[PDB]
């Protein structure tokens, strides 16, 4: 996953989780990348699938 | 299986919108972004229970898709949870609406605007969308938006979450009903 194009004003609500470095499962890439932005670049991907 | 319940495709999870039918042919509406690129749909994560297969999909620009039921045994209730749905209707500013989705359950709110333009990026823009103050999270995509016994729309997306509150855009279900020539039952 590349988050350069983010942030995005909105995200579709489909589920395909990612596991962030904060140990939280992101329900989807768009959600995950918007959080990476909101953390100002501090949040990273741990792995695909749930945490 | 009813409105709001989970639906699984090869790619991930979505929520079933409404049970519809034409003649003697049963289908179910859901989000186009979920019908895009899917062929088969199962009732469980295990993919052991087949529901049917994709019959149409419109996304982006719109956000609706239709699935033909191929499962013979599965009960196809014309409900939302156990909420009877008996008609379709146009959303209105100020309307009180309720959403049901496979990840969040039921949440209610109001319609705050019409004809909203939603740009999900990289050319996936959808237009003529209903805006509400209802929240939704991943997996709730395509679930029903209703009011009493009236079907109003299908969950498409938005921002925010259900803890902090958010904004959720839905595709008017009337639009989808017409395009496919189906009806709620
Ligand atoms: K959301």
From Swiss-Prot, chain A:
Residues 1-51 form the Kazal-like domain. It is found in: Secreted. The record marks 13-14 as: Reactive bond 3 for chymotrypsin, elastase, proteases A and B, and subtilisin. Signal peptide: none annotated. Glycans are attached at residue 40. It comes from the Eukaryota. Disulfide bonds join 3-33, 11-30, 19-51. Avian ovomucoid consists of three homologous, tandem Kazal family inhibitory domains. This is Ovomucoid. The lineage of its organism: Eukaryota, Metazoa, Chordata, Craniata, Vertebrata.
UniProtKB/Swiss-Prot annotation, chain B:
GO terms for biological process: proteolysis. It catalyses: Hydrolysis of proteins with trypsin-like specificity. GO terms for cellular component: extracellular region. GO terms for molecular function: serine-type endopeptidase activity. Disulfide bonds join 14-34, 135-162. The active site is at residues 33, 63, 141. Belongs to the peptidase S1 family. Monomer. This is Streptogrisin-B. It comes from Streptomyces griseus.
């Amino acid at each position: 996953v590349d988050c350069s194009e983010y942030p995005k004003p909105a995200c579709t609500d489909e589920y395909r989780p990612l596991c962030g470095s904060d140990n939280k499962t992101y329900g989807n890439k768009c959600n995950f990348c918007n959080a990476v932005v909101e953390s100002n670049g501090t949040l990273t991907l741990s792995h695909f699938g749930k945490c | 299986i009813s409105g709001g319940d989970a639906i699984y495709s090869s790619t991930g999870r979505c929520s079933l919108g409404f049970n519809v039918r034409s003649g003697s042919t049963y289908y179910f509406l859901t989000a186009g972004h979920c019908t895009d690129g899917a062929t088969t749909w199962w009732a469980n994560s295990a993919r052991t229970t087949v529901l049917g297969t994709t019959s149409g999909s419109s996304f982006p620009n719109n956000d609706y898709g239709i699935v033909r039921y191929t499962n013979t045994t599965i009960p196809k209730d014309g409900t939302v949870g156990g909420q009877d749905i008996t008609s379709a209707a146009n959303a209105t500013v100020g309307m009180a609406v309720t959403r049901r989705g496979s990840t969040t359950g039921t949440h209610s709110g109001s319609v705050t605007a019409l004809n909203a333009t939603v740009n999900y990026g990289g050319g996936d823009v959808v237009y003529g969308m209903i805006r509400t103050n209802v929240c939704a999270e991943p997996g709730d995509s395509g679930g029903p938006l209703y009011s009493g016994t009236r079907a109003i729309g299908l969950t498409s997306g938005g921002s925010g979450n259900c803890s902090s509150g958010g904004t959720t855009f839905f595709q008017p279900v009337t639009e989808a009903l017409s395009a496919y020539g189906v009806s709620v039952y």
